[PDB]
Amino acid sequence: TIAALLS
Amino acid sequence: TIAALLS
Amino acid sequence: TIAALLS
Amino acid sequence: TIAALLS
Amino acid sequence: TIAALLS
Amino acid sequence: TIAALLS
Amino acid sequence: TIAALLS
Amino acid sequence: TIAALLS
Amino acid sequence: TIAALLS
Amino acid sequence: TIAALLS
Amino acid sequence: TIAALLS
Amino acid sequence: TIAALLS
Amino acid sequence: TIAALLS
Amino acid sequence: TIAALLS
Amino acid sequence: TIAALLS
Amino acid sequence: TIAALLS
Amino acid sequence: TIAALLS
Amino acid sequence: TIAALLS
Amino acid sequence: TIAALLS
Amino acid sequence: TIAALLS
């Protein structure tokens, strides 16, 4: 699993 | 903004 | 089970 | 926004 | 089961 | 917006 | 079963 | 905006 | 399944 | 499964 | 923000 | 079990 | 901030 | 900002 | 068990 | 497991 | 700050 | 700021 | 386990 | 500031 947020 | 879920 | 919230 | 449930 | 909301 | 349920 | 709303 | 669900 | 919205 | 939102 | 539960 | 909050 | 519990 | 969970 | 708070 | 926040 | 308990 | 938990 | 905060 | 726990 990968959960990512690039902001 | 980049949001992702990979499973 | 995978639960996620990304904001 | 991403809201997810994989079950 | 896969549930998702993307907005 | 995308709302989805795959079951 | 596949349910989706795209708007 | 790009929204996608792939399963 | 693919559900997508490009806007 | 991949759920993504690029905004 | 990312809130996740992998179980 | 993996629980995480990232903000 | 990161709050995590791996169990 | 970069947030990620990899498991 | 691993519990952590990083701020 | 890797949980990271680069800000 | 880091507060951790590895048990 | 860089916060990480690796386990 | 590695828990780190570089600030 | 650098804080780390390695175990």
Q: Which key features would you list for this structure?
A:
homo-oligomer of 20 chains; 7 residues; rod-shaped
Molecular structure report:
It is classed as protein fibril. The entry lists the keywords amyloid, transthyretin, fibril, protein fibril. It forms an eicosameric assembly. 20 copies of one chain form a homo-oligomer. Chain A has 7 residues and is mostly beta strands. Chain A has no helices and one strand. Chain A is rod-shaped. Chain A starts with a strand and ends with a strand. Chains A and B meet through strand 1 of A and strand 1 of B.
Structure, briefly:
With 7 residues, the first copy, chain A, is mainly beta.
What's the structural blueprint in terms of helices and strands?
The structure is a homo-oligomer of 20 chains of 7-residue chains.
Chain A: E1 2-6
Please write the string of helix (H) and strand (E) elements of chain A.
E
Overall SS class of chain A: mainly beta
Oligomer: homo-oligomer of 20 chains
- Largest interface, counted with CB-CB under 8 A? A-B, 7 and 7 residues
Supply the number of helical segments of chain A.
0
What shape does the CA trace of chain A take?
rod-shaped
PDB class: protein fibril
Keywords: amyloid, transthyretin, fibril, protein fibril
Assembly: eicosameric
Entry title: amyloid forming peptide tiaalls from transthyretin
